[PDB]
Amino acid sequence: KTETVKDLGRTLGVFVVVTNCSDQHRYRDMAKIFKGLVQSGLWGCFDEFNRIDLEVLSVVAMQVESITTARKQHMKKFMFPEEEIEIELIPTVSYFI
């Protein structure tokens, strides 16, 4: 799984970042991660994404839906939830769990 995702990243020439979610996680770090992704244009692979708080899953749903809509209209500048300062975006981003 992670090998195939990383290999697709490698053959596309992009930089993949793998992280390990756990029950001790909170949404502030997930938001930091997603902001870094949308700013840089790298790929993200949250290995073992299920072993995390249902609560975190819920708020991550809102965050990921916001960024998905943001990428949908091909708009250069977009607004991120819980974070007041407006933030940019680079198209060639991706999510994997």
Add this chain to the structure above:
Amino acid sequence: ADPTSSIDELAKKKKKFPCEKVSMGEGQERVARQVIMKGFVEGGWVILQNCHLGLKFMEEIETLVSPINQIHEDFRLWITCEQHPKFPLGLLQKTL
């Protein structure tokens, strides 16, 4: 299959106001609590979602829906969940 559209169409024909919605999770306990308190003092409608997860807020609900803390009339509550055992029957004994 989801009746959320239907329930919302219902909140528009007999009730005059759009319901408020909170998806169950983190930064949502206090969020669901404060919107419930707003529904308590006004009499609006609240739509909880994904109660099959984030069960720690469920046991609080039965204490909230009580004759002690008075609630304004017309306040309804709509709960949606899925098949998750280890679901305390506090509301399962008292619900529709």
Add this chain to the structure above:
Amino acid sequence: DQFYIEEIMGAKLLDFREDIEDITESADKQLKIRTGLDEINLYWNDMQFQFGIWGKRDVPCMLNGLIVGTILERLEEDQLQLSTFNSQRHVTPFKAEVENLIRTFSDVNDTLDMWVKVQKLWTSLEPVFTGGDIARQMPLQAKQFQGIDKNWMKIMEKAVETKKVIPCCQNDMLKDFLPDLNRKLEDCQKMLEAYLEGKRKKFPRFYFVSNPTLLKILSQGSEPTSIQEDFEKLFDAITKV
């Protein structure tokens, strides 16, 4: 306290054995409870006083109790025994001393707790403002922390002169400052999150970097040396340049 067995027997032994026996077993349990009070007072007045000090890297010294776990638990069951005695029927004499003892212990408890939590906050905040660049960039809360430091050093020197934590806690002026200092430190944390949002905006890739290693990265002080060991967790595969 002055007679003979002829007199104690002139008091009829069998007829008054009910009374003498109530008093006899009562006094046996009274000796029990009296030791239970005596030894606990002897130990509690000669309690251990060893504290681990963070360091002498300034004029005053800041210490913490690495035995306060033992202190607190022994306090808990101490008040347990004292309440148990006072609740039992046969404890007529102890009410005068046991109550004062319980009061001193109960007060030193919560005073200790507030003091130690604020010490944790300050021990967290010290190395942040040890650095020069950040202290210059945010001068306001730096001098606010200096004010809390002066108050803190006054409290620490009061502790050192007391040399006994029970009177140090019996100090009354202490209890006023601690919560105010707490709320002030909360204000500081608000401003600090403001500065954190400020710091995150610079150079996206730092999002996959934790806080202290990022401070290290930004404190280069040199062109080659400081970053030559950090290229790996900042790029994919580059290691040396």
Add this chain to the structure above:
Amino acid sequence: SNEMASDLIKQLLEDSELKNKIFNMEDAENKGPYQNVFLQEIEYMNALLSEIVKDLEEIGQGLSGLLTVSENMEMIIESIALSRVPASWQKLAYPSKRGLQSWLANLFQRIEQLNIFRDDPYSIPRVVMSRFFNPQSF
């Protein structure tokens, strides 16, 4: 009125416990006249502010310390209730009128920048280049 007097000592002077009590290092009277110009204003305010802080604490020990009531006590309590620093604060120097509101602050910033003008690590040779009480001498 009364509390903030002692509280602002702990709130303002705690940052200026050096400045209201500073002494220049003796280089002594050196070549530069402007240096000696600077010097005489430095000793003006430092003496003045030293006089001011005495007033702040002797009132403090009058309130929450053991001291009998003198004449200056009633005059300063009606002045601190009037919020206007009395004629003594005006006789020593001429800052703004409202002696309580942001009046320490005007003197506060002035005495900060003054301390920088005396010892900046660049104004040690007395080379520095609103806070002046006598620009015509400059």
Add this chain to the structure above:
Amino acid sequence: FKDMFLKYCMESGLTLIVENIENEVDPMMDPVLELSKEFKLFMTCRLANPSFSPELSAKTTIIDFTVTQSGLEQQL
């Protein structure tokens, strides 16, 4: 409960009601079972069809509060 609620009830008689018997017994429960003269103790289990040991029946009396369908008819 193992230390406080015992010595309080054993020396002052607060009746120490227990409500989570599941055929497991903390060994300390028994020597207290068999000294204030103002102390009683009522304990009960929750799940039906017990498997009590032979000796646990020797100490305490056993009453079944299973209702039934038969009793249900009289209330209806």
